[PDB]
Design a protein around this ligand. Structure first.
Ligand code: NDP
Ligand code: N22
Length: 190
């Protein structure tokens, strides 16, 4: 089996993630956390996979595309299940994409909304890496895109389990970037 996790940054308490196809924030440490965790492998001869919707792919800046050091899987309902090049796979589903290569250690679902809100209730996903973002006045930030997670069916793990998961990665508490404050968290199924 492949270890499949969801990684996302969301604003509490509504868990908003975007506005008009855009990200409502630019968090410099968070971006860097995202990179290190999705890239890091333990075993040699392995890579990690990043799975995403077509729209999230289209929104990734030209030069960061495909996301380096990781296998990129792009999801569309139009896609045949084929390898485009060494770094890029097109797929109809996660299940179809997993049966396409075997060099993968960890699989990370990286967005967007339609992808998250569907794969949250898929049994393959065993971990959630949610960056919980806070703001003194959350409603002042314009938001039309939200997570629909039944978090009552999941367990927020201790920091020690997250540290285990992300290896040596530095996990700072209450990161203050402008008016935003955030923490990295780990969730497992009940
Ligand atoms: N804060 C965060 O950590 C993140 C936030 N975001 C935000 O999310 C938003 C984007 O989300 P969203 O608009 O939903 O776009 P998505 O990235 O989720 O892409 C949607 C597309 O994915 C394809 N798709 C959806 N479900 C499936 C499925 N079950 N099987 C195969 N393909 C599927 C469809 O492609 P098709 O139509 O071609 O068939 C659909 O049009 C943006 O606002 C972005 O800023 C994104 C990533 C991270
Ligand atoms: C913002 C980076 C990020 N952090 C967390 N915790 N989860 C995520 N899924 C993401 C993401 C994403 C997609 C994306 C990545 C990117 O390179 C960093 C640039 C743009 C992106 O979508 C607009």
């Amino acid at each position: 089996k492949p270890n499949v996790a969801i990684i996302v940054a969301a604003l509490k308490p509504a868990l908003g993630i975007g506005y008009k196809g855009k990200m409502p924030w630019r968090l410099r440490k968070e971006i860097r956390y995202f990179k290190d965790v999705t890239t890091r492998t333990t075993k040699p001869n392995t890579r990690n996979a990043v799975i995403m919707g077509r729209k999230t792919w289209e929104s990734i800046p030209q030069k960061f595309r495909p996301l380096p050091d990781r296998l990129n899987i792009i999801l569309s309902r139009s896609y045949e299940n084929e390898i485009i090049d060494d770094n890029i796979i097109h797929a109809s589903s996660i299940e179809s994409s997993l049966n396409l290569v075997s060099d993968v250690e960890r699989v990370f679902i990286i967005g967007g909304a339609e992808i998250y809100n569907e794969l949250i209730n898929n049994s393959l996903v065993s971990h959630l890496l949610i960056t919980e973002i806070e703001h003194p006045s959350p409603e002042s930030i314009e938001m039309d895109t939200f997570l629909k997670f039944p978090l009552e069916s999941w367990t927020k793990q201790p920091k020690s389990e997250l540290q285990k998961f992300v290896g040596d990665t530095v996990l700072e508490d209450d990161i203050k970037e402008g008016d935003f404050t955030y923490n990295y968290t780990l969730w497992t199924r009940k």
